Each structure stands twice: as structure tokens, then as C-alpha cells.
Amino acid sequence: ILPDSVDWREKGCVTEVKYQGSCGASWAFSAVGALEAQLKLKTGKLVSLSAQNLVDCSTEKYGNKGCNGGFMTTAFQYIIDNKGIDSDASYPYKAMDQKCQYDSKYRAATCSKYTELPYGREDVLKEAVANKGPVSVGVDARHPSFFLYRSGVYYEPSCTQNVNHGVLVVGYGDLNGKEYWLVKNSWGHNFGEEGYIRMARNKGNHCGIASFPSYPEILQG
Ligand SMILES: CC1CCN(CCSc2cc(-c3nn(C[C@@H](O)CN4CCC(N5C[C@@H](O)CC5=O)CC4)c4c3CN(S(C)(=O)=O)CC4)ccc2C(F)(F)F)CC1
């Protein structure tokens, strides 16, 4: 039996909501967000990791195209191969494609492995969120209702299970008769509920939230 609700923000495992701007780097924000939580769990320190590092460096070898899109999974593989990722403070976000400027002197996290969860399995996603930490996911955000969301549990009748926007599932719950996923977006603090959107849970993989989940890990040693 899993907890009825979880919110990794209450464990100090989630950094401030970021603002991707006109650069399509939600995949990089989803990836660093998941890794930030594992880093806090392991070292006790909460530090924003560099999304810009992924945009500029996890490029064609990883099937990614910076501001024109990418994958959380191959962002993790880049961090594995690179043997690190810089802090966001040392390599801050510029919302544009740049030359890779990774500097091991400012390494703030490492990545040992990542795991992918089965398509559409909201039970498995719930278990991972409860027992592993925030989970990187894609959602179908191509709906004016998504851009216009202010509060409550988001439900979009025309949503599909094809994903196009990377976000971070930092929890779940059940409020006002509606089960939801607690989702950290990267459109700044003025989007939704202080930068978060609660999305309908157990409604047949609504907006593809469980289509392509993955989470990274940092192992001892
Ligand atoms: C320029 C492109 C523009 C679009 N972006 C993503 C679109 S957004 C997006 C898409 C996905 C995503 N992952 N996968 C699984 C697989 O395809 C991933 N790949 C497996 C093999 C891997 N590897 C390992 C290497 O060794 C070789 C290789 O190929 C590489 C990864 C799919 C999708 C989209 N779906 S769909 C239309 O929903 O059905 C098709 C299948 C996930 C998150 C996002 C998120 F929104 F969160 F960002 C990608 C770059």
C-alpha cells in the first residue's frame, strides 16, 4: 500500500521553478529536476543543476537538438558519459543554443544510471514517485487550455497520449474528489499554481503523462 499523497517539495528535494522562455528546452529542465532530487537525497544539498549544460553539450550524439527539443533519457546518458554536470549557478540558463562550455571544476552532480518505466502504467509511475523520487515525464501540452491553466486539476478532453513537452512529476494526491499528478513545469512562477500544474491521474494516461517516464540515480561510490 502506497501513500495517499506525496510531495517531494516537502522533503526539500525540488529547486525553484525555472523559466524556459522561447527555447524549447523543457526536456533539459525535466532531466535536471529529476537529478536535483537524487542529489539532495544523497548529499543533503539542494542545488539547481545546469539545464544550459544539457542544451549546449547533450546534442547530436544523444539525438538532441538543444532549443529545438530533446529526450530526458539521453540527457541522463550524456551526464553518465560526461562524468558530471555543472551547477546551474556556474553555467546559468540563457534560453538559446550555445557552444558547449562544460567545466569539470564546477561539477555539481554525477549520474550512475537511469530507468525507463512502461508505457501508460500509472500504477508503476505512482510507485516510482513514492519509492524513488520525482520522475521525468513528457505530456501533451499542445492545447490552449494548458497555456491558460491557472489552478485546480487539469483535464483536457482532447488530450492525446503523444507527448511533446518535458515536465517533472514531483508528487501526486487526491483533492476535492479529483486524483492528480503534481507536476513541476518550466514556464516560470506565473504559470498555474506558482509554476506547478496538477494533472488528472488514473484517467487513462491523460495527456500521455505516463507514456515515457524515466528517472536517474546517483549510487554510493
Ligand atoms: C529533434 C527531436 C525533437 C523531439 N524530441 C522529443 C519530442 S518530446 C518527448 C518525446 C519523448 C519520446 N520518447 N519516445 C521513446 C523513444 O523514441 C526515445 N528514444 C529511444 C531510443 C534512444 N536512443 C539511444 C541511442 O543510443 C540511440 C537512440 O535512438 C533515444 C530516445 C518517444 C517519444 C515521443 N513519442 S510519441 C510521438 O509521443 O509517440 C514517440 C516515442 C519523450 C519525452 C519527450 C519530452 F517532451 F519530454 F521531451 C526529440 C528530439
Q: Report how far apart the first and last C-alpha atoms of the chain are (Å, whole number).
A: 31
For 51, the grid coordinates are 539545464
Distance CA 114, CA 130 (A): 17
Give nearest CA residue, ligand 1 atom 13.
Answer: 212
CB 139 within 8 A of CB 209: yes
- How far CA 180 is from CA of 25, 63, 130, in Å, comes to 25, 32, 14
Q: How far is the CA of 62 from the centre of ligand 1 (A)?
A: 11
The experimental technique behind this entry is X-ray
For 16, the grid coordinates are 525553484
For residue 175, give the amino acid letter. L
Exposed e or buried b per residue across 112-129, where buried means at least 16 C-beta atoms within 10 angstroms of its C-beta: eebeebeebebeebbebb
Maximum C-alpha span of the chain: 50
Q: Which letter does DSSP use for residue 115 in this model? A: E
What count of other Cβ atoms lies within 10 Å of the Cβ of residue 212? Answer: 21
Which fold is adopted by the domain 1-221? Answer: Cathepsin B; Chain A (3.90.70)
162: nearest Cα among 93, 200, 208: 208
What count of other Cβ atoms lies within 10 Å of the Cβ of residue 48? Answer: 17
Distance CA 204, CA 218 (A): 32
Exposed e or buried b per residue across 70-103, where buried means at least 16 C-beta atoms within 10 angstroms of its C-beta: bbbbbbbbbbeebebbbbbebbebeeeeeeeebe
The ligand 1 site (C-beta within 6 Å) comprises 27, 30, 63-65, 68-74, 138, 162-166, 211-212
CB 131 within 8 A of CB 117: no
